[PDB]
């Protein structure tokens, strides 16, 4: 997400077109975007086509036109000299296609070559008018779209959703590398910048969890610090931990320390989870997902989130605010974790309502009611002339206190005008996976978690291994994203390993397989690039020849399907079920950040309606279409109490609250406040609006 927020070509801004007045002509894919923009990766909201992203190989002219490289082919011989051509020259010439049979020196093989002509048309031109060729396939795609395996089997809408959800993943605590990926993972990690890279070669002298000091080849030494548990912009964690030993030898450019979402150098946004593609008892109905309890027990999908809270003590008119533990009228027991000078001690667990910074503002002397005067005279306390406005941790938050960063005026810090002291408190919590949290794959198959079963009532294999997620099978065929099925099959092959029996020669599916893909150990990481990947025939062969687990037992037969038992009723399932290893990632649409509720909170200023948003308490909006639905039902009293004694009847809200608390009957509503505001505006526009009686 950090990398793809740069390399973004937003078409809207000062000097560009707006959002409401943008025509549908400018939002389309012109045929001159081949290698200068990505047709896939756009935001799927109301910004389709107005925000794109640069291609992988593209550059920028001195003037601002987006170039792209091409190989120059001279008289039917493809050379190696690379010419950067912008869109005008690409329209002038005729450009070949990247996956065409070069004859080992530069010559084409077949006498007719698929090309790309001037007006975006595609023709069949003989192999002598061809004068340019692409550098590689996947020249059109972006960075984020280059990390989807089997992209050419997905549909374009699901590829768009996959490329947009790949940059919403959260950094887990373990960060395991994917079992089947593409090649654009190491480069996209060391170029993102969140990986410490050695500058010059040397030998490691000392590794701690805070620094590595390489001893260079000429005397000098250099110590790289680490960012340990530093908050990011969006509230996640930015931990960095070394991956070298205390005696190693490194070269220049070598990865020396991981990042948030990396594993031994390369990008890793999620975990490998054993999947089944059956429908299971309605808990995975319409894109819901059932997990296992093993992912909560073993802390597989567990992330760390860090908040911050800020209060500041300025000097108001009646005096100066004071940060101290001498709070006005309050119990002693809530002042347990607070230190001698206000702020909480480091390590103290907090909860929604606790005191973070004790600040008390001067109030002065106002009018007191006779009842409170009588109570003060009964119990002997004084007026307590200062008013408590402390900093309290908001609703729903908890977790340890990591650090307190306190500035001050007396240390000559550049606080703004009026602020005498500013203090920031960091509260971090470790969130496990739970129902309501949102998971996703790479090929655009998202979905909330419906139920976390225990580990014993999950469909287990014949060996004894329980599966870990269960994806529904009605969402695969009608959405055209069988990249997930091919990734599942190749994930099982790469997990269990293989050995193609080349005794009586190499078999004819593997005639064009490379060497040392004829055999592989278990947990072998493979890689299929984007538009030049593993074919269906190669997948069928590798599925047919794997190697057994520990005993003589091939758990998955030639179709990719296994004979699952049922962990709840006991009997085996009547038909075999597709299993395999799928790489799913946890998305940042968590259930703890979305839930809010409100009975009575803050109200607005001009009109007396409730506020809106989870940052406040905030009420829900009951608009025109819901009013039409209520009128279509015929509920008049529900509509009247939704529009009067819940929003605007200022003398009615207190009466309905005291009637609910005393247990009485709800009173009849009155005229809402916004209507009287309307009448005052209409009278102020020199119109004589008068309400008659009879």
């Amino acid at each position: 997400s950090g990398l793809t927020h740069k390399r973004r070509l937003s078409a809207l801004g000062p000097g560009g077109l707006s959002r409401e007045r943008a025509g549908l002509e400018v939002r389309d894919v012109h045929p001159s975007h081949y290698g200068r923009m990505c047709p896939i990766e756009t935001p799927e909201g109301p910004n389709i086509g107005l925000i794109g992203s640069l291609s992988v190989y593209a550059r920028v002219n001195p003037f601002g036109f987006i170039e792209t490289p091409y190989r120059k082919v001279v008289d039917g011989v493809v050379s190696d000299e690379i010419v950067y051509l912008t869109a005008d020259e690409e329209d002038r010439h005729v450009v070949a296609q990247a996956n065409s049979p070069i004859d080992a020196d530069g010559r084409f093989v077949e006498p007719r070559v698929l090309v790309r002509r001037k007006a975006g048309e595609v023709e069949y031109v003989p192999s002598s008018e061809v004068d340019y060729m692409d550098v590689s396939p996947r020249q059109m795609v972006s960075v984020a779209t280059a990390m989807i395996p089997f992209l050419e089997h997905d549909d374009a809408n699901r590829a768009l959703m996959g490329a947009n959800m790949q940059r919403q993943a959260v950094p887990l605590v373990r960060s395991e590398a994917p079992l089947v990926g593409t090649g654009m993972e190491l480069r996209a990690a060391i170029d993102a910048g969140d990986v410490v890279v050695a500058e010059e070669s040397g030998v490691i002298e000392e590794v701690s969890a805070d620094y590595i000091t390489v001893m260079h080849d000429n005397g000098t030494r250099r110590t790289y610090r680490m960012r340990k548990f530093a908050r990011s912009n969006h509230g996640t964690c930015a931990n960095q931990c070394p991956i070298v030993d205390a005696g190693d030898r490194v070269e220049a450019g070598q990865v020396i320390a991981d990042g948030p979402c990396t594993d031994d150098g390369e990008m890793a946004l999620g975990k490998n989870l054993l999947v089944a593609i059956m429908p299971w008892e309605g808990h995975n109905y319409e894109d819901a997902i059932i997990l296992s309890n093993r992912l909560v027990e073993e802390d597989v999908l567990t992330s760390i989130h860090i908040e911050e809270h800020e209060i500041d003590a300025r000097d108001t008119k009646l005096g100066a605010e004071e940060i101290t533990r001498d709070i006005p009228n309050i119990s002693d027991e809530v002042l347990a974790d607070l230190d001698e000078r206000g702020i909480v001690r480091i390590g103290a667990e907090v909860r929604d309502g606790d005191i973070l910074v004790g600040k008390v503002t001067p109030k002065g002397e106002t009018e007191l009611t006779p009842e409170e005067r009588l109570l003060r005279a009964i119990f002997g306390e004084k007026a307590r002339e200062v008013r408590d406005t402390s900093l309290k941790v908001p609703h729903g938050e908890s977790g340890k206190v990591i650090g307190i960063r306190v500035f001050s005026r007396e240390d000559e810090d550049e606080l703004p005008a009026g602020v005498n002291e500013l203090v920031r408190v960091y509260v971090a919590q470790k969130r496990k996976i739970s129902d309501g949290d949102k998971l996703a794959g790479r090929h655009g198959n998202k979905g909330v978690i419906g139920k976390i079963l225990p580990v014993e009532d999950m469909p287990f294999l014949a060996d004894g291994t329980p599966v870990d997620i269960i994806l529904n099978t009605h969402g695969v065929p009608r959405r055209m994203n069988i990249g997930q099925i091919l990734e599942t099959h190749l994930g099982w092959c790469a997990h269990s390993g293989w050995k193609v029996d080349a005794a009586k020669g190499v078999p004819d599916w593997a005639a064009r397989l490379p060497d040392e893909l004829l055999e592989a150990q278990p947990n072998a990481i493979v890689s299929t690039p984007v538009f030049d990947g593993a074919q269906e025939a190669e997948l069928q062969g590798l599925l047919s020849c794997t190697l057994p687990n520990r005993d003589g037992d091939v758990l998955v037969d030639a179709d990719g399907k296994a004979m699952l038992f049922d962990g709840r009723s006991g009997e085996p399932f009547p038909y075999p079920v597709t299993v395999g290893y799928m790489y799913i990632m946890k998305l940042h649409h968590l259930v703890d950040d979305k839930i809010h509720a409100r009975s009575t909170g803050p109200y607005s200023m001009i009109t007396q309606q409730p506020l809106g948003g989870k940052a406040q308490f905030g009420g829900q909006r009951f608009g025109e279409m819901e009013c039409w639905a209520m009128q279509a039902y015929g509920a008049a009293y529900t509509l009247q109490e939704l529009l009067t004694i819940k929003s605007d009847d200022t003398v009615g809200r207190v009466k309905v609250y005291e009637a609910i608390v005393k247990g009485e009957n709800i009173p009849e509503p009155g005229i809402p406040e916004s209507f009287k505001v309307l009448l005052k505006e209409l009278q102020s526009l020199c119109l004589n609006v008068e309400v008659l009686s009879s």
Partner: peptide
């Protein structure tokens, strides 16, 4: 290859790459 501390990730690719990927922040 071309990055020295790399995990050995075997590829299914059948084409030779003439040009390496540029710097992604240029």
């Amino acid at each position: 290859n071309s990055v020295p501390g790399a995990p050995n990730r075997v590829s299914f690719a059948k084409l030779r790459e003439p040009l390496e990927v540029p710097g992604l922040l240029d």
